[PDB]
Amino acid sequence: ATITQDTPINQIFTDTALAEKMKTVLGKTNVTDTVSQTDLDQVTTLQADRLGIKSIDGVEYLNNLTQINFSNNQLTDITPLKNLTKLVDILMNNNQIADITPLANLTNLTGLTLFNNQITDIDPLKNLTNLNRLELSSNTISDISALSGLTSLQQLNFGNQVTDLKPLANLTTLERLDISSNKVSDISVLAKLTNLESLIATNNQISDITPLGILTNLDELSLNGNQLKDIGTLASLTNLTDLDLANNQISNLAPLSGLTKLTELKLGANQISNISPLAGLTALTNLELNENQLEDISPISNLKNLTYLTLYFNNISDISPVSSLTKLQRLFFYNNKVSDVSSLANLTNINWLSAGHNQISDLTPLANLTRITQLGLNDQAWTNAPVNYKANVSIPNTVKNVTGALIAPATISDGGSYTEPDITWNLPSYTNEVSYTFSQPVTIGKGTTTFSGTVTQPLK
Amino acid sequence: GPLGSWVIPPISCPENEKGPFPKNLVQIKSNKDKEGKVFYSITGQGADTPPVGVFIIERETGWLKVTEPLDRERIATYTLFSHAVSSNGNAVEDPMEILITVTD
Numbered sequence: 001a002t003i004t005q006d007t008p009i010n011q012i013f014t015d016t017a018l019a020e021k022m023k024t025v026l027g028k029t030n031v032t033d034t035v036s037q038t039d040l041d042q043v044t045t046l047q048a049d050r051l052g053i054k055s056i057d058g059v060e061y062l063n064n065l066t067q068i069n070f071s072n073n074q075l076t077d078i079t080p081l082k083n084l085t086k087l088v089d090i091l092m093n094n095n096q097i098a099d100i101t102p103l104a105n106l107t108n109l110t111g112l113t114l115f116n117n118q119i120t121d122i123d124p125l126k127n128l129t130n131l132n133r134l135e136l137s138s139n140t141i142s143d144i145s146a147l148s149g150l151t152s153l154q155q156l157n158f159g160n161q162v163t164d165l166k167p168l169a170n171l172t173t174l175e176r177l178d179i180s181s182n183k184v185s186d187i188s189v190l191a192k193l194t195n196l197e198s199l200i201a202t203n204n205q206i207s208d209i210t211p212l213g214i215l216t217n218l219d220e221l222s223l224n225g226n227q228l229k230d231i232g233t234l235a236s237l238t239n240l241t242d243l244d245l246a247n248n249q250i251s252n253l254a255p256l257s258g259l260t261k262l263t264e265l266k267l268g269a270n271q272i273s274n275i276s277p278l279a280g281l282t283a284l285t286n287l288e289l290n291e292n293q294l295e296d297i298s299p300i301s302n303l304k305n306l307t308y309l310t311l312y313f314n315n316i317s318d319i320s321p322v323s324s325l326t327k328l329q330r331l332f333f334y335n336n337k338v339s340d341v342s343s344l345a346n347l348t349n350i351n352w353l354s355a356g357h358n359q360i361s362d363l364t365p366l367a368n369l370t371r372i373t374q375l376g377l378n379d380q381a382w383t384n385a386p387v388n389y390k391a392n393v394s395i396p397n398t399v400k401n402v403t404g405a406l407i408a409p410a411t412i413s414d415g416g417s418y419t420e421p422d423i424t425w426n427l428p429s430y431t432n433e434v435s436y437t438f439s440q441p442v443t444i445g446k447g448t449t450t451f452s453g454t455v456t457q458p459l460k
Numbered sequence: 461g462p463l464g465s466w467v468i469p470p471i472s473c474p475e476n477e478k479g480p481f482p483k484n485l486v487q488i489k490s491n492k493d494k495e496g497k498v499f500y501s502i503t504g505q506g507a508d509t510p511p512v513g514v515f516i517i518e519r520e521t522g523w524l525k526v527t528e529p530l531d532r533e534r535i536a537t538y539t540l541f542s543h544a545v546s547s548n549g550n551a552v553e554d555p556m557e558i559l560i561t562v563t564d
């Protein structure tokens with residue numbers, strides 16, 4: 001493919017978006033301006049991403065191309081690349097490519113990015129043995145037998161129907177792998193990938209992690225959204241710094257106790273009632289413990305490096321163990337049983353404070369947390385100690401804003417009324433309980449919410 | 461107020477990251493997901509305004525991902541917004557401004 005006479009750019013590059021790009025690459029001022037083969041020979045790299053290109057017809061004349069970026073376009077047919085054998089890197093994620101047969105003879109390729117396309121058949125990749133980086137996630141690939149000979153791969157992903165991982169067996173140079181969202185259960189082959197440093201395997205059907213036992217070079221592991229219960233194997237992975245085990249069925253955290261290099265640990269949406277095994281994980285800056293069965297959190301008291309902590313959707317009454325976590329910047333404990341927030345006054349650098357659906361009646365301990373930018377105090381609820389039923393029965397309102405002033409009730413049950421500080425009822429006969437609600441917008445620092453709730457008053 | 465039921469950690473990504481791309485940054489979450497199915501989306505710089513698609517979000521899972529290596533000297537921060545809409549077509553949260561900082 002060679003230009004033998006000065007030819008208009010728009011007659012070489014037929015796609016109108018690619019002609020416009022090439023006009024600029026080639027230093028011209030009109031897409032009808034003529035160019036020669038020596039003009040086209042000057043083009044060794046091409047960054048043509050994000051331009052609405054449908055066809056790359058004309059690339060075939062760019063005889064000196066070594067690198068291309070056609071990502072984020074509308075490419076289908078990639079036939080024009082077939083004879084650009086000097087190509088060593090291709091970026092073509094986010095297109096509509098199905099047939100990659102044109103890539104089969106580009107044997108000098110070391111990097112190939114094809115994620116988010118319409119690829120099913122990867123058999124043309126068999127002869128690309130020089131590949132060290134290959135991205136195939138967000139496709140409809142179900143068979144990786146074509147990858148079996150790509151023994152220089154260091155970075156790899158694929159998707160989304162690859163259940164048989166056996167073809168990875170000889171890819172011992174793999175350092176970074178992502179097999180997320182492939183409905184994979186059997187990860188036994190991974191034991192062979194002894195140089196693996198990062199394994200991402202979210203949203204699969206993994207229950208047996210024993211194959212990871214000998215993968216002691218792992219520093220990053222994500223098994224978020226699987227069916228894990230027994231995590232005993234993880235005790236061997238002492239180089240782990242970033243571990244995600246969220247959305248599983250884990251109860252026994254003892255295997256994690258010796259993983260002292262962990263800085264990020266995600267355990268949300270499990271079956272944890274005992275975090276005593278986490279007490280020695282002092283390098284932790286991020287810890288997620290939401291959606292468990294926690295009550296006692298006293299083991300968290302030594303984790304002084306924590307800047308991000310989730311505890312929402314537990315059964316915690318005593319939040320006080322967070323008082324020593326003075327570096328905390330974001331704290332989330334919506335849906336717990338906390339009434340006493342006195343200890344939070346110690347979290348002077350808190351920015352995000354999410355404390356809705358607790359039993360909080362008094363905001364005064366939060367008054368000085370002026371670095372707050374995001375706040376949540378909705379839907380509190382508690383039951384007062386019982387009082388005696390009388391026809392003209394009154395109780396003191398105990399709901400206090402950040403200023404210390406009482407918050408007037410929004411609603412009062414059984415036709416009751418309010419005048420500060422008493423809520424008074426007029427009941428016909430005996431009733432076992434009355435109630436009231438409150439709803440008050442409030443800002444602390446720059447964080448805004450509605451401090452609201454429902455107070456139940458039993459009558460004996 | 462603005463926080464609503466959002467659960468988001470601070471987001472920073474080193475420049476010149478090694479593949480494979482796309483890479484998961486954080487899993488954006490709204491606890492309105494306890495009331496019904498929620499669908500996540502992102503708008504702004506690096507999402508639907510230039511450079512488009514540098515950051516993407518997986519609609520059902522909330523996984524915020526980066527699609528390519530970053531360069532601090534080229535863009536040092538991205539100002540994005542996360543959105544959460546129910547299966548009955550209504551926003552369940554106010555959109556949250558997320559500042560992504562590109563580090564060393």
Ligand SMILES: [Ca+2]
Nearest residue numbers: 268269291493
């Ligand atoms: Ca959840």
Ligand SMILES: [Ca+2]
Nearest residue numbers: 475531532533
């Ligand atoms: Ca740089």
Ligand SMILES: [Cl-]
Nearest residue numbers: 025045046047
């Ligand atoms: Cl270019």
Ligand SMILES: [Cl-]
Nearest residue numbers: 246247268269
């Ligand atoms: Cl979680």
Ligand SMILES: [Cl-]
Nearest residue numbers: 326327328349
């Ligand atoms: Cl600090």
Ligand SMILES: [Cl-]
Nearest residue numbers: 354355356376
């Ligand atoms: Cl909240």
